[PDB]
Amino acid sequence: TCPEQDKYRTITGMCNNRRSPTLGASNRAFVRWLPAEYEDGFSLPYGWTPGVKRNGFPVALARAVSNEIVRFPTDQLTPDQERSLMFMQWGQLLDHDLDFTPEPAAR
Amino acid sequence: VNCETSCVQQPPCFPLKIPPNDPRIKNQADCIPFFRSCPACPGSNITIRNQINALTSFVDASMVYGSEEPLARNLRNMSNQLGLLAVNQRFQDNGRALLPFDNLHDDPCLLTNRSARIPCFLAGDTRSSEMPELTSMHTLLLREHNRLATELKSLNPRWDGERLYQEARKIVGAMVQIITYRDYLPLVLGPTAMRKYLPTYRSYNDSVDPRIANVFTNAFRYGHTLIQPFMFRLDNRYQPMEPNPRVPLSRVFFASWRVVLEGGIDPILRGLMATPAKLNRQNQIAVDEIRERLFEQVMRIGLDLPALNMQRSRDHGLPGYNAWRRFCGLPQPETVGQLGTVLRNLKLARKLMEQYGTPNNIDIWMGGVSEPLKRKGRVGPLLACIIGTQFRKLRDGDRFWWENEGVFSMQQRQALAQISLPRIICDNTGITTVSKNNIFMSNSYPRDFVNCSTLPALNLASWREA
Ligand SMILES: *[C@@H]1O[C@H](CO[C@@H]2O[C@@H](C)[C@@H](O)[C@@H](O)[C@@H]2O)[C@@H](O[C@@H]2O[C@H](CO)[C@@H](O[C@@H]3O[C@H](CO[C@@H]4O[C@H](CO)[C@@H](O)[C@H](O)[C@@H]4O)[C@@H](O)[C@H](O[C@@H]4O[C@H](CO)[C@@H](O)[C@H](O)[C@@H]4O)[C@@H]3O)[C@H](O)[C@H]2NC(C)=O)[C@H](O)[C@H]1NC(C)=O
Ligand code: HEM
Ligand SMILES: *[C@@H]1O[C@H](CO)[C@@H](O)[C@H](O)[C@H]1NC(C)=O
Ligand SMILES: *[C@@H]1O[C@H](CO)[C@@H](O)[C@H](O)[C@H]1NC(C)=O
Ligand SMILES: [Ca+2]
Ligand SMILES: [Cl-]
C-alpha cells in the first residue's frame, strides 16, 4: 500500500501516483484551478437568496438566459459539414470515463 | 425532500425558477428540478464547499470496467477462467453480445415503453442507458474486451482468468487513449490549440496533478451544442431504416428498448457515422429537444439542459467568464463593445449584457460556447484552454499511459498504433462498410466510406509469452 511494483491499473485508480496515491482516484474531491465563488463565501450558490447581487449586478435566472440566448428554431439547424455525429457521441463516452458528480437521492 | 416534486428552496434542493412569459412553462409557481451536488465535506463551517468525482480521472476505460471494486467484480464473467465481461442473458443483437440488465429500485428505462419491459443496462458508468447512441458505444467496447480475451487465450493457453482480463483491459484502455488523443482532441481544439496545450509526449511526470478540475465538468459540456434533435438509424446499405429512421430525441432518452427490440447497435452506429453533427453557431447554440424536452418521458416535466449547466456552475461555485479568461491569459472585456469584439458578435454581446450586466458574471458554459470557434476546431479560445489543460494533465500525470516506458513493449506500441474506431466497429458488429479516417470528420455516404477488408485488424503477435 502501495505495492512497490505493479503491472496493471487498480480499479479505484489508487497508486497511479506513488507520492500522492489518491490523485485521480475515484470518490475524491475535485481539484480547483480557481478559488470558489459563493453567495455566503463558502456554501450558498449565487441565486439562492433573492435580492443578493453578484459583483454589483442582479443574478439572472438560468432558464431566462436559456430562453434569450440559447433558444433557436429547430428547422433552422446548420449541419456540420466537417464533423460526424460520432464526434459528438465519443465526447459523451469520453466524458463518462473522466467524471461523474454525485447527487443525493430522495429523500 | 423531494427536489424532484417540490419547488421549495431548502437543502439539498436548488430548483430553477421560472421567468415571466416563458415559451413552455406558463406556470410561474412551477420550477425545474435540481439536486445540489453533494459536498466532499458535509455541513462544514471551515472548508469552502467542493464537489466529488465518483470516477477515475484517468483515460482508463473506467466507463466499461468500473471505478469501484464491488461494481468491477460484478461486471466480470465469474463462471469461467476466460476473463470475459458479463453479457446479457436474456437478449442478443443478432447473435452478438449485449450489456447485462441492471437491478435498480426505480428504473427509468421501463418508463420509456411500458409494454416493452426493458430495464437499464449495467456498465462501468451509471449513465450507460441515457441514450441508445451511448449504449451502442458501451456495447461495442464490451464486445471488444471479449474478442481480445478470446484471441489472447489462443496465443497464451497458460493464462488464467485474472491474467486474461487485466491484459485485455490494458489494451481497451490504451485503445480509448489513442482514439481520444490522436483522432478526437485535434478536431476539438484545432491544430493551433493542439500544439499549445498538447505538445509531443515525452514521458510520465509524477509531479503533474492528474485530477479532474471542477471547471472541466462544466466546460466539457460544450458537446451539448453538437447534439442533433433526432436519433438516426440506417440499414446495412446506409438508407433510412423503416419505420422509424428519424426519432425525436425526447423519446430516445433512457429508451433501452430501442436497442433490444428495434434492431440493435448496428443501425445506430451506422447513423452516427453517416449523419453530420450539429454545428455550434452563435444564434443556434442548443436544440429544443434538450432545452425543452430533456427526459420528458421519465420526469414530471421536461428539463432544460443548458439551463441545468448554468445552474450547476453556480452550485459548484465556479467563477464567472472573465475570471476564467484571466486564468487562461485571455483578455477580459469590460464593456458591451469590448465583448462584441471578443465574440465577433455585438448582437450576442448585447443579449449577454442584458442578462448578466457584466462579462464578469457570465456563466462559464454560456460564455464558453458563445465564443467563435477556432480554425478547424469546435471550441473557442477559452474552452480550448480549459479542455486542453485538463487532457495534458491526464496524459502526463498518468503512470499507465500507453506510450510510457514499461507499460508496453516497443512492438506492442507499434501494433497498438494501428488501431482505429472504424476497425473496432468492423471487428464487433455486422457492419462491413465503415468511415474513412478521420472517423470524426467523415460524415457523408458513400464518399467518406470504405470496406472492412481494406482495413487490417490489431496484430496480437507481440502479446505471445513464449
Ligand atoms: C513535471 O511537471 C511539472 C508540472 O508542470 C505543469 O503541468 C504541465 C502538464 C504543463 O502544463 C506545465 O507547463 C506546468 O508547469 C513541472 O513543474 C513545474 O515547473 C514550472 C517551471 O519550473 C513551475 O513554474 C514555476 O512556479 C514557481 C512557483 O511560484 C508561483 O506559484 C504560485 C502558486 O501556484 C502561482 O501563483 C505563480 O503563478 C507561480 O507559479 C515560480 O517561482 C516560477 O517563477 C519563474 O521563475 C523562472 C526562473 O526560475 C522564470 O523564468 C519565470 O519567468 C518565472 O518567474 C515558475 O513560474 C511550476 O510551479 C511547476 N509545477 C509544479 C506543480 O511542480 C516540472 O517542470 C515537470 N518536470 C519535468 C521533468 O518535465
Ligand atoms: C447524448 C446526449 C447527452 C445527454 C442526454 C446529456 C445529458 C446530461 C445531463 C442530464 C447532465 C447533468 C446536468 C446537470 O447537472 O443537471 C450532463 C452532464 C455532463 N455532460 Fe452532457 N449530455 C449529452 C451529451 C454530452 C456530450 C456529447 C458531452 C461531451 C462533449 C457531454 C458532457 C457532459 C459532462 C462532462 C457532464 C458532467 C459530468 C459529471 O457528472 O460531472 N454531454 N449531461
Ligand atoms: C460467461 O461466459 C460463458 C461462456 O462464454 C457464457 O456461456 C455465459 O453466458 C457468460 N456469463 C455471463 C453471465 O455473461
Ligand atoms: C413499445 O414497444 C412495443 C414492443 O414491445 C411496441 O410494439 C410499441 O410500438 C412501442 N410503443 C411505441 C408506440 O413507441
Ligand atoms: Ca477513468
Ligand atoms: Cl476549478
3-class secondary structure per residue, chain B? CCCCCCCCCCCCECCEECCCCCCCCCCCCCEECCECCCECCCCCCCCCCCEEECCCCCCCCHHHHCCCHHHHHHCECCCCCCCCECCCCCCCECCECCCCECCCCCCCHHHHCCCCCCCCECCCCCCCCCCHHHHHHHHHHHHHHHHHHHHHHHHCCCCCHHHHHHHHHHHHHHHHHHHHHHHHHHHHHHHHHHHHHCCCCCCCCCCCCCCCEHHHHHHHHHHHHCCCCEEECECCCCCECCCCCEEEHHHCCCCCHHHHCCCCHHHHHHHHHHCEEECCECCECCCHHHHCCECCCCCCCCECHHHHHHHHHHHCCCCCHHHHHHHHCCCCCCCHHHHHHHHCCHHHHHHHHHHHCCCCCCCHHHHHHHCCCCCCCCCCHHHHHHHHHHHHHHHHCCCCCCCCECCECHHHHHHHCCCCHHHHHHHHCCCCEEECCCCCCCCCCCCCEEEHHHCCCCCCHHHCCC
Bond into B19 cis (ω within 30): no
CB contact under 8 A, A93 and B137: yes
Q: Which residues of A touch B316 (CB under 8 A)?
A: 36, 101
Cβ proximity of B122 and B133 under 8 Å: no
Q: Which residue has the cell 460564455?
A: B367
Q: Nominal resolution in Å?
A: 2.9
> Going by C-beta distance under 8 Å and a sequence separation of 6 or more, which residues neighbour residue B35?
A103, A104, B3, B12, B13, B14
Which set of grid coordinates corresponds to residue B125? Answer: 458508468
**Protein residues whose CB sits closer than 6 Å to any atom of ligand 2:** A 88, 91-92, 95, 99-101; B 130-131, 134, 217, 220-224, 227, 305, 308, 312
What's the rounded Cα separation, in Å, for the pair B367 and B149? 46
Tell how far CA B23 is from the center of its chain.
30
Q: Residue B200, CB half-sphere, CA atoms under 13 Å: how many?
A: 1
Cβ proximity of B313 and B364 under 8 Å: yes
What's the rounded Cα separation, in Å, for the pair B252 and B293? 11
Task: State which of B207, B390, B405 you would mutate to test the pocket of ligand 1, scoring each by most atoms of that ligand within 8 A of its C-beta.
Answer: B207
In the annotated binding site of A for heme b, the residues are 95
What's the rounded Cα separation, in Å, for the pair A64 and A73? 17
What's the rounded Cα separation, in Å, for the pair B253 and B107? 13
Q: Which residues of A touch B363 (CB under 8 A)?
A: 62, 65
The dihedrals phi and psi of B171, each to the nearest 5 degrees, come to: -75, -50
How is chain B split into domains, by residue range? 1-466
Bond into B372 cis (ω within 30): no
Q: B395 CB less than 6 Å from ligand 1?
A: no
Is A96 considered catalytic here? yes
What's the rounded Cα separation, in Å, for the pair B375 and B187? 10
Chain B residue with the nearest C-alpha to that of A103: B37
| Residue in A31, A69, A85 nearest the CB of B272 | A85
- Does any CB of chain B come closer than 8 Å to the CB of residue A83? yes
Neighbours of B156 (CB within 10 A): 17
Tell how far CA B200 is from the center of its chain.
25
- Which residue has its alpha carbon closest to ligand 4 atom 14? B113
Which residues have a beta carbon within 5 Å of ligand 5, which is an ion? A 97; B 56, 58, 60, 62
The dihedrals phi and psi of B29, each to the nearest 5 degrees, come to: -75, -20
Cα–Cα distances (Å) from B354 to B267, B305, B359, in that order, read 45, 21, 11
Residue type, B261: L
- Does any CB of chain A come closer than 8 Å to the CB of residue B382? no
Residue type, B349: A
Cβ proximity of A33 and B213 under 8 Å: yes
What's the rounded Cα separation, in Å, for the pair B249 and B136? 15
Cβ proximity of B242 and B261 under 8 Å: no
Closest C-alpha to A61, from A49, A47, A72: A47
Q: Is B62 annotated as a binding residue?
A: yes
Residue type, A75: D
| Ligand 5: centre distance to CA B57 (Å) | 5
Q: Which residues of A touch B278 (CB under 8 A)?
A: 77-80, 88
Q: Do β-strands B31-32 and B449-451 pair in parallel, antiparallel, or remain unpaired? A: unpaired
Q: Which residue has the cell 448578466?
A: B356
Cβ proximity of B437 and B269 under 8 Å: no
What's the rounded Cα separation, in Å, for the pair A36 and B357? 21
Give which of B6, B34, B50, B57 to mutate to test A binding, by max A Cβ within 10 Å.
B57
Strand partners, B450: B434
| Ligand 4: centre distance to CA B262 (Å) | 9
Distance from CA of B138 to the nearest CA of A (A): 8
Give the method used.
Answer: X-ray
Task: State which of B221, B298, B304 you would mutate to test the pocket of ligand 2, scoring each by most atoms of that ligand within 8 A of its C-beta.
Answer: B221
* Long-range CB contact pairs, A3-12, < 8 A, 24+: A7/B166, A8/B166, A8/B169, A8/B170, A8/B400, A9/B58, A9/B60, A9/B169, A9/B170, A9/B173, A9/B400, A11/B56, A11/B62, A11/B65, A11/B66, A11/B67, A11/B68, A11/B69, A11/B72, A12/B56, A12/B67, A12/B68, A12/B69
| Residue range B1-466, CATH number | 1.10.640.10
Distance from CA of A52 to the nearest CA of B (A): 13
Q: Which residue has the cell 428495434?
A: B262
DSSP letters for chain A: ---SS-SS--SS-TTSSSSSTTTT-SSEEPB-SS----SSSSSPPTTSSTT--BTTBPPPPHHHHIIIII---GGG--EEEEEEHHHHHHHHHHHHHH---------
